[PDB]
Design a protein around this ligand. Structure first.
Ligand SMILES: [Mg+2]
Ligand SMILES: [Mg+2]
Ligand SMILES: [Mg+2]
Ligand SMILES: [Mg+2]
Ligand SMILES: [Mg+2]
Ligand SMILES: [Mg+2]
Ligand SMILES: [Mg+2]
Ligand SMILES: [Mg+2]
Ligand SMILES: [Mg+2]
Ligand SMILES: [Mg+2]
Ligand SMILES: [Mg+2]
Ligand SMILES: [Mg+2]
Ligand SMILES: [Mg+2]
Ligand SMILES: [Mg+2]
Ligand SMILES: [Mg+2]
Lengths: 66, 116, 83, 188, 151
RNA sequence: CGGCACGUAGCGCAGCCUGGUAGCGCACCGUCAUGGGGUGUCGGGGGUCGGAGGUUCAAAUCCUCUCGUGCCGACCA
RNA sequence: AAUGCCCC
RNA sequence: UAGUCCGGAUUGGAGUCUGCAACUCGACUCCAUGAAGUCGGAAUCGCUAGUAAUCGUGGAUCAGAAUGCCACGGUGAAUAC
């Protein structure tokens, strides 16, 4: 690590809407506000709602029948 | 100024701002704002973060860009694999809803290709 | 699309034919002309030869076809290209 | 200034015979049975621009000259002089009235025009084949009774006069071919 | 027309000031038969013009028109192989009318925010001898001057 | 035979010297004008350089070899 | 007093 | 003053109605989608006063199916040397 070459790099707090606070060293300078972090992202409860397979004959018989 | 994976303009009123999302038009946006108790005259600037988190909640209650485009594309593809009339129409790129094609099909056919 | 309260439409001759087919459990090509009927779940797996004007095109009914009408799968004009 | 011999130079060379640059355009070498060989060269006087006919003797010969051409770009005119520049060396340069004869009305600004320089000095400039120009003066065309095309005289922002069809009015940029002095299209 | 000279129709004066020529001006400005809209526009522009100018609306409008009015204009004839451009003097009523037309057209050209603001800027600039309208007046006088050799 | 200078859009020519983009005219396509055709006006498209192998980061261009077409003489005996 | 050809 | 809170074409999903029957091929509604288009080349068209321009309404045909056709009024000009 040279002296004048690299940019500033300091400990910065990161708060998400998950309710998790994170002390991270980064180049953002000021504080940091998150919308989605790792622990809140709909990645483990989303693999079904982000595909939405369904069934057309079920849709039809629910729509009507004999 | 960032909801549902898209950045939203920050000076325009909240209704238009939310219409900037793919899958949210004017009526859907008014519904979002009503359900979140946010006024319409306010812009995304000058709006507290808890409010924007409620907005995120509502937009997540709906179906938006990723899921939406996946649904749209999957339906189009279902048609084109079924090979029904709409399927062939989609594959060949002509109007599906029954419009005329003798003339005036330029939205599906792009600019005119001169015969050579 | 037909009104919902009326229910899906289908010709009674086609109805009796498909009931006969599913009770005979035979894979015979079911010739018809009713391109206005709506495909029903009891026809999945059946081979229906439907009219298109000139002649009868054979369609094999799959789990997905349960919504459309036989006209969707009997194309009725022939267009190759202009050159 | 390597001296060049007659049965050596083909087209393209810039010979310097008699205190005057030239440019061999074509040359026919002949070696007849029983006689001294010669070449009938179709020379080109490179200062007045007239084609001279010279039968050269195998032996008779001439020194070369520094006449060269490349792509200069017109910049500006001031008094009696035209200044141009390179895009690969950015070397400044100034011509004179003689060099720009009748191409004054064809060069506007920034045109990339081939120039012939000799002794490190321009002698002849060639305007780009097509130049976009604007019309300073025209008579508002009125079809009147014309039954044929008619045409219309129109001065340009550089003094030139061209026949423009009928509609081109004033302030419309046209395209002219420097070669023929004629209208090609009205550039929108 | 060929046969008959005709009589001019009467125009009722503008309501706010009672002046035939401002009534003519709002008529010229109107499109689609939206006389109320044209009136609102012209009165707003006239208000802000009087503000910028000091002196009242009538004299402000009149000096703008005095600056935009032409005296002699040109007309083409196509005599022989070359077409001509004959300068003929402009009768009053015509010079007023086409002055108003030049002004409103310059206003339509100008890219400000509102039509009232465009018209106001145009009237003020014309009152101070600037803008595309008075420039068109210059160009008309210049052509005529050029072709003065014809009569 | 050599030497030699050509081979580039349907035709005729530029470009090539001094490597990086292929241009020009006619023709061709679609409107317009006209009772209709033409002249005319407005717009559009088209080639990749006879072929192959080298140099090169890259070849219409530079080299070399092939194919084709022209021109010059292949004389004293 | 510019141009204006032809119609099996 | 932005391809925009302009423009609405196109397409996905969901429906209403008429009609034995809206697949080829109806109209309309809801949600989403938001093309081209920033005033239009040569040329060309209508209009002289309640006219042009613009804004709505009705009728015939007709179960359903008009931006067409036939009528009706509202606002309402420029110019003709
Ligand atoms: Mg909508
Ligand atoms: Mg239709
Ligand atoms: Mg001025
Ligand atoms: Mg102007
Ligand atoms: Mg001898
Ligand atoms: Mg003849
Ligand atoms: Mg704009
Ligand atoms: Mg209706
Ligand atoms: Mg666009
Ligand atoms: Mg007419
Ligand atoms: Mg009349
Ligand atoms: Mg109407
Ligand atoms: Mg109606
Ligand atoms: Mg009725
Ligand atoms: Mg009316």
């Amino acid at each position: 690590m040279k002296k004048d070459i690299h940019p500033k790099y300091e400990e910065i707090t990161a708060s998400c809407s998950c309710g998790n606070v994170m002390k991270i060293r980064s180049t953002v300078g000021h504080d940091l506000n998150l919308d989605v972090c790792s622990k809140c992202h709909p990645f483990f409860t989303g693999k079904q709602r982000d595909v939405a397979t369904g069934g057309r004959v079920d849709r039809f018989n629910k729509r009507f029948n004999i | 100024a960032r909801i549902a994976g898209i950045n939203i303009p920050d000076h325009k009123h909240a209704v238009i701002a939310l219409t900037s999302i793919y899958g949210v038009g004017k009526t859907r946006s008014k519904a979002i704002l009503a359900a979140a108790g946010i006024a319409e005259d306010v812009k995304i600037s000058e709006l507290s973060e808890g409010q924007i988190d409620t907005l995120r909640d509502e937009v997540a209650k709906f179906v938006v860009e990723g899921d939406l485009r996946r649904e749209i594309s999957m339906s189009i593809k279902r048609l084109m694999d079924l090979g029904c009339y709409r399927g062939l129409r989609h594959r060949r790129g002509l109007p599906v809803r029954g419009q005329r094609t003798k003339t005036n099909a330029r939205t599906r056919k792009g600019p005119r290709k001169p015969i050579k | 699309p037909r009104s919902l309260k009326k229910g899906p439409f289908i010709d009674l001759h086609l109805l009796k034919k498909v009931e006969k087919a599913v009770e005979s459990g035979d894979k015979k090509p079911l010739r018809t002309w009713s391109r206005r009927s709506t495909i029903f779940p009891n026809m999945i797996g059946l081979t229906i030869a439907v009219h298109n004007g000139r002649q009868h095109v054979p369609v094999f009914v799959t789990d997905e076809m349960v919504g459309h009408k036989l006209g969707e799968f009997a194309p009725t004009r022939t267009y190759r290209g202009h050159a | 200034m390597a001296t060049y011999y007659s049965n050596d130079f083909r087209a393209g060379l810039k010979i310097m015979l008699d205190g005057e640059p030239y440019a061999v355009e074509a040359s026919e070498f002949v070696k007849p049975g029983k006689g001294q060989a010669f070449a009938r060269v179709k020379l080109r006087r490179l200062l007045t621009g007239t084609r001279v006919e010279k039968t050269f003797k195998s032996t008779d010969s001439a020194e070369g000259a520094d006449v060269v051409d490349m792509n200069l770009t017109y910049l500006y005119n001031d008094g009696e002089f035209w200044h141009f520049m390179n895009n690969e060396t950015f070397e400044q340069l100034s011509a004179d009235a003689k060099a720009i004869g009748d191409n004054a009305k064809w060069l506007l600004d920034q045109a990339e025009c081939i120039v012939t320089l000799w002794n490190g000095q321009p002698i002849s400039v060639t305007p780009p084949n097509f130049v976009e120009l604007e019309i300073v003066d025209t008579d508002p065309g009125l079809k009147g009774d014309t039954a044929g095309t008619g045409g219309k005289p129109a001065t340009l922002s550089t003094g030139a006069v061209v026949k423009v069809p009928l509609f081109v009015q004033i302030g419309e940029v046209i395209k002219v071919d420097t070669r023929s002095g004629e209208y090609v299209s009205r550039v929108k | 027309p060929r046969r008959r000279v005709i009589g001019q129709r009467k125009i009722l004066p503008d309501p706010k000031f009672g002046s035939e020529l401002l009534a003519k001006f709002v008529n010229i400005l109107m499109v689609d038969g939206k006389k109320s809209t044209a009136e609102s526009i012209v009165y707003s522009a006239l208000e802000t013009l009087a503000q910028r100018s000091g002196k009242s609306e009538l004299e402000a409008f009149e000096v703008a028109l005095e600056n935009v009015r032409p005296t002699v204009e040109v007309k083409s004839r196509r005599v022989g192989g070359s077409t001509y451009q004959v300068p003929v003097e402009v009768r009053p009523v015509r010079r007023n009318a086409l002055a108003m037309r030049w002004i409103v057209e310059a206003a339509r050209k100008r890219g400000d925010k509102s039509m009232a603001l465009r018209l106001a800027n145009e009237l003020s600039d014309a009152a101070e001898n600037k803008g595309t309208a008075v420039k068109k007046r210059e160009d008309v006088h210049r052509m005529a001057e050029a072709n003065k050799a014809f009569a």
